[PDB]
């Protein structure tokens, strides 16, 4: 499987089975810059 | 499988089976810049 | 499979089977800039 | 499969089978700029 | 398959089989600019 | 298949089989600008 | 499986079975720069 | 399995079974720089 | 299993069974630099 | 199992069974530099 | 099992059974440099 | 199966969406 | 199965989405 | 099964999403 | 099973998400 | 099973997420 | 089982997340 | 089982996370 | 079992995390 | 069992973590 | 069993961690 | 059993950790 790439939060490469992944984010003025390629 | 690329939140490359992925985001004035290519 | 690219939220490349992906976003004045190509 | 590109929300490249993807967005004055090409 | 490109919401390139994709958007004065080409 | 391009909502390039795609939008004064070509 | 790469949060390469992964993030003005490639 | 790489938080390579991984982050003005490749 | 690499927090290579891993981080202006490759 | 590598916090290579691992970090202006490869 | 490598905190190679490992860190301006490879 | 109940006050822009799929193999 | 109840006040922009899928193998 | 109850005050932008999936093997 | 109750004050941007999955093997 | 109760004051950006999974082997 | 109660003051950005999993072997 | 109670003052960025897992062998 | 009570003052960035696991062999 | 009580003053970055595990053999 | 009480003053970066494990053989 | 009481002054970086394990053979 391919690489899992994240800045904030989680990067999950393993297979997930009956298994919950969750993330609650509360941001006051976030700024995100992505240069994907 | 291809690379999973994320700035905030989760990048999941593994196969997910009976398995919940969730993310609750509450942003006050987010700004997102993406240069996809 | 191709690369999954996201700025906020989730990038999921694995095959998902009986498995729920959800994201609740509540933004006050978001601004999104995308340059897709 | 092709690349999945998203700014906010989810980019899903894997095949999804019996599997729900959902996103609830509540925006106060969002602004979106897209330059697709 | 071709690239899935979205600013807000979801970009889904994988084949979807018995599988629901939904997005509820509630915007107060959204503004969208698209330059498609 | 061709690229799926969307600003708000979903861009779906994969073949969809027995599978529901839905989006509920409630906008107070949206403004949309499209320059398609 | 591929490498799991994260800046803040968790990088999970092992297969996860009946097992919950969660992350609660509360950011005041985060700034994220990603150069993915 | 692949290497688990994280700056803050946890890098988990072992298989996780009935086992919870969680991280609560509260950041005042975080800045993240990632050069993934 | 692959190497678990972390700067702050925990690097866990062993299989975890009925066993909880948690980390509470409270940062005032963190700065993270990652050069992943 | 692979090597567990950490700068601050814990590096755990043994299998963990019914056993809790936790770390509470409170940083005033941390700076993290990682060169992962 | 692999070597457990840590600078501050604990390096645990033995299997841990019903046994809690915890570390409370309170840093004023920590600086971490990691060259993992 | 599922019963969605939605109330909107006066002068309020609103949508209701309901999707049900029954699969019987 | 699931009953979603949503109330919106007056002059309030709102959406309700309900999805149910029943799978019987 | 699950009952989501959501109240929105007046002049408030809001969404409710409900997803249920029943699997019977 | 699970009952989510969410209140939003006036003039407040809000979302509710509910997901339930029942698996019966 | 689980009852999440969330209150948001006026003029406050907010999300509620609820996930339940029932597994019956 | 678990009851999460969360209060947010006015003008406050907030999220609630609830996850329950029931396993019955 | 577990009851998490969280209060946030006005103008305060906040998250609540609740996870419960019940295992019945 | 466990009751976590967390108070945050005004203008304060905050998280609450609750995890419970019940194992019944 | 365990009751964690945490107070944060105004303008203070804070986290609360609670973990409970019950094992019944 | 154990009651942790933690107070943080204003403008103070803080964490609370609570872990309880009950083993009943 | 054990009651940890921790006070932090203003502008002070702080952690509280509590661990309890009950073993009943």
Numbering used by the authors:
A (entry chain K), B (entry chain I), C (entry chain G), D (entry chain E), E (entry chain C), F (entry chain A), ...: 85 to 121
L (entry chain B), M (entry chain D), N (entry chain F), O (entry chain H), P (entry chain J), Q (entry chain L), ...: 85 to 109
From the paper:
The human nucleoporin Nup98 forms fusion proteins in certain types of malignant leukaemia, is a critical component of the permeability barrier of the nuclear pore complex and is mislocalized in cytosolic deposits in Alzheimer’s disease.
Polymorphs pm2 and pm3, which are almost equally populated, were solved at a resolution of 3.3 and 2.8 Å, respectively, and are formed by two protofilaments. A leucine-phenylalanine pair (L91-F92) is located at the tip of the β-turn, with both side chains pointing away from the turn. In all four Nup98FG85 fibril structures, side chains stacked along the fibril axes build glutamine and asparagine ladders (top). Most of the stabilizing interactions arise where there are clusters of two to four phenylalanine rings and one or more leucine side chains.
